[PDB]
Amino acid sequence: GRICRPLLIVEKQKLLLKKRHIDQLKEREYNNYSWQDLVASGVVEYIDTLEEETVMLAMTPDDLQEKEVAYCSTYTHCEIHPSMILGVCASIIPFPDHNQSPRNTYQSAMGKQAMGVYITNFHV
Amino acid sequence: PGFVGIRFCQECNNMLYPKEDKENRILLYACRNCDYQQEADNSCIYVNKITHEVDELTQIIADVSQDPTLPRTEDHPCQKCGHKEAVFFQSHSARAEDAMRLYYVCTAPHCGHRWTE
Amino acid sequence: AIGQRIVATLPYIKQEVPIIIVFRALGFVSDRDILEHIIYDFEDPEMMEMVKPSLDEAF
Amino acid sequence: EDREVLRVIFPTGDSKVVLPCNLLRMIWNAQKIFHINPRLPSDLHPIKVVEGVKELSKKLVIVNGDDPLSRQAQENATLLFNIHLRSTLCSRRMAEEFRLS
Amino acid sequence: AKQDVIEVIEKAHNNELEPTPGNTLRQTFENQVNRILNDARDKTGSSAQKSLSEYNNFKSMVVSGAKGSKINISQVIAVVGQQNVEGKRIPFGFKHRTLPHFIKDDYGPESRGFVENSYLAGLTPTEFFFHAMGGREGLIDTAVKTAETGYIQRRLIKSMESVMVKYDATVRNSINQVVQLRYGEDGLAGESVEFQNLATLK
Amino acid sequence: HTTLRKVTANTAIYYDPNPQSTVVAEDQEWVNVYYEMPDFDVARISPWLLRVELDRKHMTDRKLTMEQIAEKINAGFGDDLNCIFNDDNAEKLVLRIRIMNMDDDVFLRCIESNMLTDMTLQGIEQISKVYMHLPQTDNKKKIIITEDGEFKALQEWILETDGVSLMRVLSEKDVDPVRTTSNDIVEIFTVLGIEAVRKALERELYHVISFDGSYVNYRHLALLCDTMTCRGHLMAIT
Amino acid sequence: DDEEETYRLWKIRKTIMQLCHDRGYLVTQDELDQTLEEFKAQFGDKPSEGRPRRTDLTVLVAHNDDPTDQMFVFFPEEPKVGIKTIKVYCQRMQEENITRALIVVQQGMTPSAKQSLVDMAPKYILEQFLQQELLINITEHELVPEHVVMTKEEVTELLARYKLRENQLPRIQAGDPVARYFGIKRGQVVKIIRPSETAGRYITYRLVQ
Ligand SMILES: [Zn+2]
Ligand SMILES: [Zn+2]
């Protein structure tokens, strides 16, 4: 029952997700290098709500860059992408960060009454 | 003034309660379970700090310097070891209104000096 | 009455029970043992005086 | 006297009131309906203004009755409006401000 | 504005901030920061408003009063501003943090929910979440006030439903008891009255 | 309202068998300056002492002195509870109590916990906090009529309390018993009556309605307020 | 401790004189607006020791319409007034042939004393007042409108004009602060004149209960 989410672990001030992992992920369909191999490599970690209190997140790897005034300089994890904070129906809104939030909630409710093809085998 | 601690009997290990000996006109600490008595050495039985003038440096522990989520600064070096980096944080403790005060801790391992500006 | 008393609302029991009574019912009768289990730093009189009413209520 | 009554009614100097008839708008309507020239002398006698306002005040009845209790209740019901009416339909204002015929 | 808030934070951190009468030091610091950021929001909104041309359609609809307000223009062009939950900045829902992306004990404007972007610029992820929090507050208010207000409406109606103007012009209830000797103390209906000025008062 | 806790720094109970040689070293000066002449029944003295330390900040913030405090203690408990104190010159504002004649020490602790809560040094009960300020809006300013006949808004100090004792606050020197009011309509009804609460209730409903800039015709408020007050008591809409 | 005591006594006396004047009792202008220093000259500035004693503060006024219709104002010394004191005051009123009185208590009045004040009403109409509620004249408050006790002829004229029964008028409790100030009993009607923002003036009538 503990809700958690995956995050990219961070070294001293660097991601552990090197370019070799992206390379093996690009040919995911040939070399059967999958998400579980990414987790087993110690590059990704599932962090729950209670362990997030002890975690210092980077919103993007740009936060790990050394800046004229360092904000943290001791990050421990990084977001895979901030847009993953949204759910299924809010992930259909284009440019949801340019709307008033009630509008995004009303769309998230109204994407569910929208017509389409609810399922491919609707004939049976 | 300082607080007064609880003291226990030497036989039943129950707490000693205060009592007065009229014969010598002297304070005693006696157990109401066994029949033990002791000559007090503080003469003070109760202390209430209504002002709550607590030194929060005593509540801090050096281990907090290992917290990745605390801010670090290079501007306040340690007076005990000379390390440059140090974590800082606010009181965040109830019963402390002027809690914007910052407390610093040295991040050098095994030094753990704590102070306040 | 005098200070702040600590109680314990155990299941299947419709009346509050002092914590010291519960500790004694578990085999810890000496007040030293109970505060060894409750207060881990004996250099701290604040915790001590705040637990003292519960001891005074269960003697 | 009406001024002092208003001063005790509205202890703060707030002249905004809610009343039945918009007397300034009716005066403007009369000015435009009869083509009143504000630059020429008027043919309205100030005594006619006084008498007409008094008769009007008598005709505006909220509480009906000649008994003294009905008279006092009638006085009270239309007090604020009658003050507004006497201060708006004043003979001087009707002579040099509105210049009605 | 952010440098001003940083200065106030530095003052508070150095105990160079003394409380004002009627408030604790935390509340005085919060008042100073909120004043700085409200001033920033208003100044930026004025800048956006003066930038508008006569052909701007936001300005057209706001000027006519058809729809919108100058604050909406400011949020679309200049800055969305401070997000509040229960009338205060974003609370420390984590341990001394608003989100895991901030350091502990960060009372800065961006940490506590100041959206320094406009809706055209687009909100950053933390601004997006804080704005969603502030909007959730409005949704909850809209959905929770209705029951209490409707119960108040029903209660008022059932309390006054039979009070009526009678043919003797008195206002009376069903028991025939007198509530007002004349309706509104003047026996006049509320549709025909209107605002005027007493010329002899001031 | 100011209780002894609001102005107290820290309380403590000692076992002082003879006041001449006190347990504390810094309180030996004024105790002997008090004891060299017999002011009270020294024989009816208990060895349990109750020393309270005040703080200069809260003493000055209320213009309070040990004289008033000691008088209040000796009035609330009579002569049964002796209290002594130094002048308002020492670096620490301290005053020492003893009980005159459950065990004694427990009684001292109990009266300590009581005095720190119920001993009203200054102020009116049920009034927690009071804020003095100048009203910038004319609705709270003092609107007078000058000798020339113009309305003039005098900018004067007004107090806003966090509790209500309208009954007591009205009957205070230099307090206006004519304009001083409250938002607790029940107290207005209890103190001023049914027509006063009618008017006050109209004012409060108008304040609630108009605070958002709205406007409602006064006859509707008047009818609601007459419905709640036409039977001589406050008739809730419930 | 003492200057405030005499100040309170003077304020109470001032409110009592205003009250008696509003009830229609003969009160001279001199005592109606009596300065605090004049009060000290006439009664003293040391009530604690016994100058003035509250027994010296007793007032006795006569109605303007009837010189025989007099009224007392007693200031008991004890904070909690007991039934014995009520019996003493009633005895004095019997001796002096006075039928109305006000008792300005300090702390309160015992239940037996209140029951005595209630049971013997048809003989002696004697009322109870706290000194705390006489330190201010509530009729001077801005919220309190102008109350006027109507006469039976006026009440009959009112009910005949509006053609209604007494139970159809709005009500005022007999224990109302202003009803107690004017000393009005059940069956009496009080005319309230208040300013109205829509009509200028408004008169309403409340029946006492
Ligand atoms: Zn023992
Ligand atoms: Zn160090």
From TrEMBL, chain A:
It is found in: Nucleus. RNA-dependent RNA polymerase that catalyzes the extension of a non-coding RNA (ncRNA) at the 3'-end using the four ribonucleoside triphosphates as substrates. An internal ncRNA sequence near the 3'-end serves as a template in a single-round Pol II-mediated RNA polymerization reaction. May decrease the stability of ncRNAs that repress Pol II-mediated gene transcription. The gene is POLR2B. It comes from the Eukaryota. Belongs to the RNA polymerase beta chain family. Residues 35-82 form the RNA polymerase Rpb2 domain. This is DNA-directed RNA polymerase subunit beta.
UniProtKB/TrEMBL annotation, chain G:
One of its GO terms (cellular component) is RNA polymerase I complex. Residues 136-208 form the RNA polymerase subunit H/Rpb5 C-terminal domain. One of its GO terms (molecular function) is DNA binding. It comes from Sus scrofa. InterPro entries: Arch_Rpo5/euc_Rpb5 (IPR014381), RNA_pol_Rpb5_N (IPR005571), RNA_pol_Rpb5_N_sf (IPR036710), RNA_pol_subH/Rpb5_C (IPR000783), RNA_pol_subH/Rpb5_CS (IPR020608), RPB5-like_sf (IPR035913). It is found in: Nucleus. GO terms for biological process: transcription by RNA polymerase II; transcription elongation by RNA polymerase I; tRNA transcription by RNA polymerase III. This is DNA-directed RNA polymerases I, II, and III subunit RPABC1. Keywords: DNA-directed RNA polymerase, Nucleus, Transcription. Belongs to the archaeal Rpo5/eukaryotic RPB5 RNA polymerase subunit family. Residues 3-93 form the RNA polymerase Rpb5 N-terminal domain.
